[PDB]
Amino acid sequence: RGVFYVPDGKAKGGEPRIILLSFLGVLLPSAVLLTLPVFSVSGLSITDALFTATSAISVTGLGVVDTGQHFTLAGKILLMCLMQIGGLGQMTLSAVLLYMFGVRLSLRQQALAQVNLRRLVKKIVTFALVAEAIGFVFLSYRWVPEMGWQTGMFYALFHSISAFNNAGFALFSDSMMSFVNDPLVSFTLAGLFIFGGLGFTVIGDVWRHWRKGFHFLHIHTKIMLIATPLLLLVGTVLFWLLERHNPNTMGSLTTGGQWLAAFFQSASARTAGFNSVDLTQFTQPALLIMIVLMLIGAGSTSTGGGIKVSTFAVAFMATWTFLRQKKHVVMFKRTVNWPTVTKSLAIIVVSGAILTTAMFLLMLTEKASFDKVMFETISAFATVGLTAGLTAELSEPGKYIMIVVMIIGRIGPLTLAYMLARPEPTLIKYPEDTVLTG
């Protein structure tokens, strides 16, 4: 309908400010709420409540305390709402900013030479509820007979929301450890964060243009529809190869159980948080592969992720273009322009710089092996929330650092994307000089 906007006023991106205040505008009121003893059986410390509130809003799922026991029924519902706000809130907020970014692009194109925002938000909410509804009934098919009518629905509806939102919060002491060989819950959860971590743009593009075929889909949709099954396949096969002979975590399973555990871990590695198998007794070569999977994350307009799959895909094919010394980066017979290539490369290098300082700080505040420090830092930054045992023994300074890593990792790649999009214009430019690289 009406394609227009009101300019902010007297020319730098204000969208990073919108994202930053939106996240801080909900974390602080949620933090003081968790201090009230109505939500916790015994009460939480200011640091513990802040860490829990950050993990719920970031939907990282990292817990300094046990979710199932330390929180009351009111607290469990409070956690339920927050992971709606963290996952669906970002998914809606990213879609709203993406919609408004295109509107400014469209009007500037008209000056030189689509549904409305309210309509778009309705589909985002509708998709989230219908997806969680499908997960709810399938999860209720098993848990209701086991635990009863009222407990069965609550656990089913809790985990349907958590899985779709990429939250990873589990009401059991061990996250999905009791369902290693159970396909119903393992696949119901898997589908929830696979499509939850797929992006509204991918779902929306497939919804509106599936009849024209795959060839006429958007470039971003084609990337996600190929890389996500490719990442799931390589994750499942490579986890299976490195863990089939380890007695501690996966060696005592059936042949079908071998692949179910391998697939579930790979699917949850891409920012879900559930772990069918134990990560403490999980071999180092498989730790690195999961670390890569956590970084690659989910889609751009999804419920969770680190750097997104499209960001990894562009840099991966930029490298292929560079080694074959092609002039343009090309996928699906489309040229990826250099600013997009710069955005993909800049996000990786900035994230790596943040990760290195965060990793360095943790080994100072707490004393543990480096393989544990790197794994925890990636999980907090990539918002996966998979732990390797260092989270339980975290110190007070370590909790503060991990809160900052969770906040920066949740908004960083999306915020740095928009800073690169609209830099402040300058009337004074300096001469260009060549700097030797290599």
């Binding site: 309908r1 009406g2 394609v3 227009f4 906007y5 009101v6 300019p7 006023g9 007297k10 020319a11 400014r104 009007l107 500037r108 008209q110 000056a111």
Partner: protein
């Protein structure tokens, strides 16, 4: 009281400045964002919009405003089309800035309320001021 100016060029910006000085609510609409920012501090509301698009004009309730200025000068076609959309949208008074006599013939004869050619009108008055 409430005024709408479409096109924020030399003529459009000048209209907005006086309308704000008289304590009136003025709406500035322009396709180019850079020009909207210049007039942002001189109007009550500044919107970047395309008044050639019929649905965009529908959302911005121009029929509620008492007077509407179409101050597009470069494109003869855009000014004619914007005027015709405003009339069918329900605007009672439409003032159009015309750069040439040929366009002024079209705009008046399709139903524009007032026709303004800046170059001609000062041509009359500058002569009158020299005479007396």
């Amino acid at each position: 009281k409430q005024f709408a100016v479409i096109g924020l060029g030399r003529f459009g910006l000048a209209v907005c400045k006086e309308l704000q000085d008289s304590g009136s609510q003025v709406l500035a609409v322009d396709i180019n964002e850079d020009r909207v920012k210049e007039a942002a501090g001189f109007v009550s509301q500044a919107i970047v919009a395309n008044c050639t698009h019929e649905e965009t004009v529908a959302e911005l309730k121009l029929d509620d405003y008492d007077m509407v200025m179409i101050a597009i000068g470069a494109d003869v076609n855009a000014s004619i089309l914007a005027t015709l959309i405003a009339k069918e949208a329900g605007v009672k008074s439409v003032w159009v800035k015309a750069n040439d006599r040929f366009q002024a013939r079209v705009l008046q004869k399709i139903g524009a309320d007032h026709i303004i050619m800046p170059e001609r009108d000062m041509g009359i008055r500058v002569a009158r001021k020299m005479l007396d």
